PDB file of N, CA, C and O in Angstrom:
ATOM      1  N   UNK A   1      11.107   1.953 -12.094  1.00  0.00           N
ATOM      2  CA  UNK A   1      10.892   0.495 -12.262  1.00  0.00           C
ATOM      3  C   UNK A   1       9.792   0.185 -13.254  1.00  0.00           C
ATOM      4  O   UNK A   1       9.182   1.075 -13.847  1.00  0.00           O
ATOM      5  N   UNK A   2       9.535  -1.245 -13.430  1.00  0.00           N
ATOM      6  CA  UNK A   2       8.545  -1.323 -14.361  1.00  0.00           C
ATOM      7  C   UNK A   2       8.536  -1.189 -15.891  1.00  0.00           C
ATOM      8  O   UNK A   2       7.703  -1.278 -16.793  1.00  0.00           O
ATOM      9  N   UNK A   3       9.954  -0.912 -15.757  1.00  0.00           N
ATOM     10  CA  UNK A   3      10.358  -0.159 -17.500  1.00  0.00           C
ATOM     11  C   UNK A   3      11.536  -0.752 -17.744  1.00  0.00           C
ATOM     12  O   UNK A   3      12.409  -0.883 -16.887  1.00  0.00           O
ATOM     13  N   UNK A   4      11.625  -1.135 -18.908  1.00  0.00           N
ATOM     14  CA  UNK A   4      12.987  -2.469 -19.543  1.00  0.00           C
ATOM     15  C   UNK A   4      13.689  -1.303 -19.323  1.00  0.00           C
ATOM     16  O   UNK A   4      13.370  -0.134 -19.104  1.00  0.00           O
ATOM     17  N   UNK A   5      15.356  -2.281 -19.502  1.00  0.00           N
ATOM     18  CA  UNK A   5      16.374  -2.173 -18.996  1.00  0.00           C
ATOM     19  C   UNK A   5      17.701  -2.949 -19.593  1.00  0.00           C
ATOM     20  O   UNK A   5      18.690  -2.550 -20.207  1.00  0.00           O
ATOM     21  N   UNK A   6      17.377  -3.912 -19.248  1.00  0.00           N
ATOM     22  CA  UNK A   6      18.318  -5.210 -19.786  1.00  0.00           C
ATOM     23  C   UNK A   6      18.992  -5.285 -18.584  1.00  0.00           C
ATOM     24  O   UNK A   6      18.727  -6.132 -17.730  1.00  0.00           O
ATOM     25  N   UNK A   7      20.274  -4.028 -18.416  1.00  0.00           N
ATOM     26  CA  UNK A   7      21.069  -4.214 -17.333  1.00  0.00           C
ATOM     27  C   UNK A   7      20.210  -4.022 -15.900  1.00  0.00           C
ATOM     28  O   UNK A   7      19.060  -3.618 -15.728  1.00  0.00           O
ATOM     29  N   UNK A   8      21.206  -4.465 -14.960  1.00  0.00           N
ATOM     30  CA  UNK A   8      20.626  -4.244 -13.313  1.00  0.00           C
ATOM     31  C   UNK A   8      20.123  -2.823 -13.561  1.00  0.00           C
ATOM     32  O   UNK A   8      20.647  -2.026 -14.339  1.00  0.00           O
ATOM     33  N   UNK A   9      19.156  -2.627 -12.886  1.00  0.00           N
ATOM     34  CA  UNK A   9      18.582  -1.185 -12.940  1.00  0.00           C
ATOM     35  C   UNK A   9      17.997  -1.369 -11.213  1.00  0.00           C
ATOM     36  O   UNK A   9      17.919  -2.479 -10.686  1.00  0.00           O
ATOM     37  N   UNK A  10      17.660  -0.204 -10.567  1.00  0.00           N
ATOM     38  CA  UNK A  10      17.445   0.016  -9.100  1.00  0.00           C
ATOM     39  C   UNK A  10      16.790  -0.799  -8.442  1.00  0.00           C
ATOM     40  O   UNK A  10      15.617  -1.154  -8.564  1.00  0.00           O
ATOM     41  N   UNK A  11      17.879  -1.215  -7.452  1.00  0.00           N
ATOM     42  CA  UNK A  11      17.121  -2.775  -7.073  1.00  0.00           C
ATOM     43  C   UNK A  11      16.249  -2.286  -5.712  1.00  0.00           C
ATOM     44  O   UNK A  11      15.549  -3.077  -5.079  1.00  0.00           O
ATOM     45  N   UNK A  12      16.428  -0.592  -5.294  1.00  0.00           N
ATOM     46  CA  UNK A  12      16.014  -0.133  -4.521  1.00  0.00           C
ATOM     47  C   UNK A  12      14.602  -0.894  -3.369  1.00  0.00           C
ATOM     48  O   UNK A  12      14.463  -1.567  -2.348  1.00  0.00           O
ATOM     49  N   UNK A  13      14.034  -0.384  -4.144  1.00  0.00           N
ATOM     50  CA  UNK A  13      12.211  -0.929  -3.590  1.00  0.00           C
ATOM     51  C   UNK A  13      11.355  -1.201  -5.499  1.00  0.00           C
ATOM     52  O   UNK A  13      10.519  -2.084  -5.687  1.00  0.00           O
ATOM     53  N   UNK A  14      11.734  -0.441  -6.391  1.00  0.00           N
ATOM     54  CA  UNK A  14      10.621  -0.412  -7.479  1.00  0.00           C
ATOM     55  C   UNK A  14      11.639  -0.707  -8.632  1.00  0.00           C
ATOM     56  O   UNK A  14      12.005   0.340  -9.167  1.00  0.00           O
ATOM     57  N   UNK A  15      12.369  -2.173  -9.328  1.00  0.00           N
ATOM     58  CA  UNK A  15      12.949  -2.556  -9.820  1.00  0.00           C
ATOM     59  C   UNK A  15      12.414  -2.634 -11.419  1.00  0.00           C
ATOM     60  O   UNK A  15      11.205  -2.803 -11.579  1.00  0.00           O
ATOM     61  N   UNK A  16      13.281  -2.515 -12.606  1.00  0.00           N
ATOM     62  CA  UNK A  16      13.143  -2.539 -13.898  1.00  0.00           C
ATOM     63  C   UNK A  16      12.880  -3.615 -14.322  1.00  0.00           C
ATOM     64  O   UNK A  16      13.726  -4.509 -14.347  1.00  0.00           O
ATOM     65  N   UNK A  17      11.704  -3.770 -14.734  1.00  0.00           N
ATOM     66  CA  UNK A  17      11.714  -5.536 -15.162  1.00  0.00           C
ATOM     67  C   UNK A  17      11.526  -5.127 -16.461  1.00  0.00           C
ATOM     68  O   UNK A  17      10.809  -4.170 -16.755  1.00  0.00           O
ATOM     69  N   UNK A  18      12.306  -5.998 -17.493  1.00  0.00           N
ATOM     70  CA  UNK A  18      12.116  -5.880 -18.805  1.00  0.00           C
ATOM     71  C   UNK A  18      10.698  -6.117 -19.290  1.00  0.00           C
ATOM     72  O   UNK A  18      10.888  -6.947 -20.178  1.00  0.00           O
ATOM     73  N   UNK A  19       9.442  -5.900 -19.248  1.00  0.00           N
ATOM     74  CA  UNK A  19       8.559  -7.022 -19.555  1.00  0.00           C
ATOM     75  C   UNK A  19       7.378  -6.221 -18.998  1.00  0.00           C
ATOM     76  O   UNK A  19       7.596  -5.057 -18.663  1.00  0.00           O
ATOM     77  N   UNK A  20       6.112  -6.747 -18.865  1.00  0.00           N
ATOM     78  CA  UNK A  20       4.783  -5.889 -18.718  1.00  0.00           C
ATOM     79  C   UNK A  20       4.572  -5.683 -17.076  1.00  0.00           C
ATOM     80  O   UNK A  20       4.739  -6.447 -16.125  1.00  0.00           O
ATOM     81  N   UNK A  21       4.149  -4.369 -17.179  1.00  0.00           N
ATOM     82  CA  UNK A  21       4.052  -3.937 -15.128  1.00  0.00           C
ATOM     83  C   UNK A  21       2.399  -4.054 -15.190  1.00  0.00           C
ATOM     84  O   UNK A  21       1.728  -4.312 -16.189  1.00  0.00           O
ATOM     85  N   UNK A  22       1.996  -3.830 -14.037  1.00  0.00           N
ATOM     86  CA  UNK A  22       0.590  -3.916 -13.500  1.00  0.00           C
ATOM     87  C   UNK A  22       0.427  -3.066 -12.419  1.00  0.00           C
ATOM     88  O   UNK A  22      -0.394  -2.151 -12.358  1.00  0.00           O
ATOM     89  N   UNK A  23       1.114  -3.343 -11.685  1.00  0.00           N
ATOM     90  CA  UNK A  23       1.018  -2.486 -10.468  1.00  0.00           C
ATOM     91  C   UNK A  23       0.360  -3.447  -8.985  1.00  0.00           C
ATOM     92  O   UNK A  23      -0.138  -2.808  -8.059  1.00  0.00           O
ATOM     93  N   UNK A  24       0.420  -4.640  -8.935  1.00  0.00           N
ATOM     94  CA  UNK A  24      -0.315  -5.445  -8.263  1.00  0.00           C
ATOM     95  C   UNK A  24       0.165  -6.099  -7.237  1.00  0.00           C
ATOM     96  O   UNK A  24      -0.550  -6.375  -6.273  1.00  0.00           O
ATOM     97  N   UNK A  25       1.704  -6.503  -7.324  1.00  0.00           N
ATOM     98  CA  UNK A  25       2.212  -7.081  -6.420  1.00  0.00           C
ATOM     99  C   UNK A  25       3.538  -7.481  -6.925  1.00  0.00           C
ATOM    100  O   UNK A  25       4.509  -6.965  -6.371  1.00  0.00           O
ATOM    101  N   UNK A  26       3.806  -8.586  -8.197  1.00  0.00           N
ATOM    102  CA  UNK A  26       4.845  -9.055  -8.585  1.00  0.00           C
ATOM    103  C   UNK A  26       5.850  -8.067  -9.322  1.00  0.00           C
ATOM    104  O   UNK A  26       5.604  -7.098 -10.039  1.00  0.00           O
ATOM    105  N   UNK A  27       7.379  -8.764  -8.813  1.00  0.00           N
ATOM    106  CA  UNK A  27       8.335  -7.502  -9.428  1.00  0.00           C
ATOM    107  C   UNK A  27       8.777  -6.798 -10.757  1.00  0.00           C
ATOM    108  O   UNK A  27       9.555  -5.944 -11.181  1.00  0.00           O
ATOM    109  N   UNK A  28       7.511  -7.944 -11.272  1.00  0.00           N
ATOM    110  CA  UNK A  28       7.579  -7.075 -12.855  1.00  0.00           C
ATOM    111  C   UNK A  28       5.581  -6.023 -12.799  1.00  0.00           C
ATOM    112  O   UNK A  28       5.213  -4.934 -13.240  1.00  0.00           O
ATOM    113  N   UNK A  29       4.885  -7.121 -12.040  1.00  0.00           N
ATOM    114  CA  UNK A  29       3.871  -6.386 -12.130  1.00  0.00           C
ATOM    115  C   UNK A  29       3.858  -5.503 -10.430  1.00  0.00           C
ATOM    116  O   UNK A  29       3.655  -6.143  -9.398  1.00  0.00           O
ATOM    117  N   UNK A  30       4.018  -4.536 -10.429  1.00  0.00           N
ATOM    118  CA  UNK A  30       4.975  -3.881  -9.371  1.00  0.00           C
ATOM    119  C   UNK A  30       4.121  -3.113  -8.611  1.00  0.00           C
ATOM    120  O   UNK A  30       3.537  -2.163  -9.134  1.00  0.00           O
ATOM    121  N   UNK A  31       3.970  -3.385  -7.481  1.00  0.00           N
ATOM    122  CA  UNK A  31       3.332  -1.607  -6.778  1.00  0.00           C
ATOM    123  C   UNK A  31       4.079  -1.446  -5.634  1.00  0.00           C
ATOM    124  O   UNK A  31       4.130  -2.425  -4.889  1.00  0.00           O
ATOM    125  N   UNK A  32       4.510  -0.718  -5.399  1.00  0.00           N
ATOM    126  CA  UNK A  32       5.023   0.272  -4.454  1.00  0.00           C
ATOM    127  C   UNK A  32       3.974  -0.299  -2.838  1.00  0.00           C
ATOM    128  O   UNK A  32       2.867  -0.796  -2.634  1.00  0.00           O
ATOM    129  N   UNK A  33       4.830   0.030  -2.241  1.00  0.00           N
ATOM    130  CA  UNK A  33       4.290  -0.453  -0.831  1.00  0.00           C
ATOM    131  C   UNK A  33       3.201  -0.472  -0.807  1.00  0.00           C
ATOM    132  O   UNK A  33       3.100   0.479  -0.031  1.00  0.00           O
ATOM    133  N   UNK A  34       1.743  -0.873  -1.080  1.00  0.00           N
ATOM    134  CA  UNK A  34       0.629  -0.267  -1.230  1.00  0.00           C
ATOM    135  C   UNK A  34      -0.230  -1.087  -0.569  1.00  0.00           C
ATOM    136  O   UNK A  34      -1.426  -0.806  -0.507  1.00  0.00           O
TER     137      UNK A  34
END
């Protein structure tokens, strides 16, 4: 996740957002259960 894509990519738990990650909370800025 966290890494472009365009198409659906794993909607699992840690999803591909086209666009900048962080790690913080939101599903582009993403963290893992934490």
């Amino acid at each position: 996740g966290c890494k472009p894509k365009g198409a659906p990519c794993s909607p699992l738990m840690y999803p591909c957002c086209t666009g900048p990650c962080w790690d913080l909370s939101l599903d582009c800025s993403f963290c893992v259960f934490c």
